[PDB]
């Protein structure tokens, strides 16, 4: 006999396009179970469930792929016929298409001090937020103007979008880094302009240039007398004088004067 209890159907309330779902349908208290036919289907698509049997029951588990042709509210159904009687369970499932938000930069690599604008568009009904702006999502697209600076090189611009589907919030996000080229710099902290060393002492002159791309460095006095940056040298009277340090890269050129003063013993 087939009981008056309908089958239990377990399935997610929503399912994304081009993704695989999992549906399981079960019923206890029916016999003979071998004579029972289980028909599992999502809308028009007849599913193929691998059925586990007991002496008095069945458990039908089935995967279900969905495409753009399934988009919308489909009906997941699980019918069980046992001779003359029949029990079926219905459940709605919404197949939704929700692409990832498109964070779009005017130019991927920009020069320093340039007006860069970062946009993020998404699904019309969805609501987006660009690096937490606006706080609490409102409308499907957001902007952000910025004066490009060296600190913005490698700066990520994340966009979070939320889409309401069948009474629940689905979340997605996208992230894109900005590349910012910035001219050479000889900053004082990594290249001081004044040394004072005792004669015949071991010293290492220090000077690093900043820039994207990495600048090439060269410090010369009296024409072509190189200051050995990074090397540990014996300080002599020959090293005394004012050097002209020059940083070089595709973004420009900078100079800094570095004086070396030798104290006689």
């Amino acid at each position, epitope marked *: 006999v087939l009981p008056a209890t309908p089958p239990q159907l377990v399935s997610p309330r929503v399912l994304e396009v081009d993704t695989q779902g999992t549906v399981v349908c079960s019923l206890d208290g029916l016999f003979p179970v071998s004579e029972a036919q289980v028909h599992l289907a999502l809308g028009d698509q007849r599913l193929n469930p691998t059925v586990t049997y007991g002496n008095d029951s069945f458990s039908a588990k089935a995967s279900v792929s969905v495409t753009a042709e399934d988009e919308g509210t489909q009906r997941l159904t699980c019918a069980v016929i046992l001779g003359n009687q029949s029990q079926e369970t219905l459940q709605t499932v919404t197949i939704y298409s929700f692409p990832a938000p498109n964070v779009i930069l005017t130019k991927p690599e920009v020069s320093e001090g340039t007006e860069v604008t970062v946009k993020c568009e998404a699904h019309p009904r969805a609501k987006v937020t660009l690096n937490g702006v606006p706080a609490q999502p409102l409308g499907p697209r957001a902007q952000l103007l910025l004066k490009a600076t060296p600190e913005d090189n490698g700066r990520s611009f994340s966009c979070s979008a939320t889409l309401e589907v069948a009474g629940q919030l689905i979340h997605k996000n996208q992230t894109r880094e900005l590349r910012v080229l910035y001219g050479p710099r000889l900053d*004082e902290r990594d290249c001081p302009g004044n040394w*004072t060393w005792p004669e015949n002492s071991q010293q290492t002159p220090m000077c690093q240039a900043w820039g*994207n791309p990495l600048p090439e460095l060269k410090c010369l006095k009296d024409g072509t007398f190189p200051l050995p940056i990074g090397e540990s040298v014996t300080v002599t009277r020959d090293l005394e004088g004012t050097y002209l340090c020059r940083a070089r890269s595709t973004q420009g050129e900078v100079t800094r004067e570095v004086t070396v003063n030798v104290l006689s013993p």
Partner: antibody, heavy 114, light 108 residues
Framework: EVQLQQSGPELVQPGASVKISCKTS????????MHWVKQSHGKSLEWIGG????????SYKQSFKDKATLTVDKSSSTAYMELNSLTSEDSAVYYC???????WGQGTLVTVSA | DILLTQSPAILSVSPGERVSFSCRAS??????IHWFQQRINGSPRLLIE???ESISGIPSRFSGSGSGTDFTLTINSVESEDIADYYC?????????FGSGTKLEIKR
């Protein structure tokens, strides 16, 4: 985002050594000089030295010459400071810092005790 | 080496007031001075760069001034979360040196 991740708490015998690592990420390692600062528990900062991140050339304060040794592994973008002949006076928090002290590490508490 | 002496050591003040930190240099160092904030159990945090140039991501209430030997950090309107140690640092000639420090306490 810029991150300087230091090696974390150390306990070492007097006379022993310790090698504090500063694993960097989120920027070009060879662009900026790496500096190392010490802070005693009396809360007074002190520049140990700096190391050139291209050629490995280092410069030290007179106090920490022979005491401290700065080195660099460019491939892994990591700076190492080794301290040796450790006394109780060397017990303090040690910081790696970079880009003219714009980015610091979380600090490494070194303890010298028998 | 260039010696930096800060004053006062402790700086007890109510919220909303205009507080000021002093840092005197032993030599004349132009504008090669930088200010740091250190909250307890935390790393130092660069506030002001080269006397008066502002750092990105730092509140507007933090400003700096001075040139040569005397330098000043100023908080326009002090807030409760400004409790910390404050250090000046010179970058004119190596080695880098820091000030003795000033501690900002909050009245309540």
């Amino acid at each position: 985002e810029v991150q300087l991740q230091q090696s974390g708490p150390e306990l070492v015998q007097p006379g022993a050594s310790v090698k504090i690592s500063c694993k960097t990420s989120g920027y070009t390692f060879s662009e900026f000089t790496m500096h190392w600062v010490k802070q005693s528990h009396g809360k007074s900062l002190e520049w140990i030295g700096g190391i050139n991140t291209i050629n490995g050339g280092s410069s030290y304060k007179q106090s920490f010459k022979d005491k401290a040794t700065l080195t660099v592994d460019k491939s892994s973008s990591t700076a190492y400071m080794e301290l040796n002949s450790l006394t109780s006076e060397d017990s303090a928090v040690y910081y790696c810092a970079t880009k003219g002290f714009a980015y610091w590490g979380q600090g490494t508490l070194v303890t010298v005790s028998a | 080496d260039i010696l930096l002496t800060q004053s006062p050591a402790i700086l007890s003040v109510s919220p909303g007031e205009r507080v000021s930190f002093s840092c005197r240099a032993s030599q004349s160092i132009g504008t090669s001075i930088h200010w740091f904030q250190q909250r307890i159990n935390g790393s130092p945090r660069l506030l002001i760069e080269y006397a008066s140039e502002s750092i990105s991501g730092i509140p507007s209430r933090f400003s700096g001034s001075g040139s040569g030997t005397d330098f000043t950090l100023t908080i326009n309107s002090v807030e409760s979360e400004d409790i910390a140690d404050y250090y000046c640092q010179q970058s004119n000639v190596w080695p880098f040196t820091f000030g003795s420090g000033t501690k900002l306490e909050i009245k309540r």
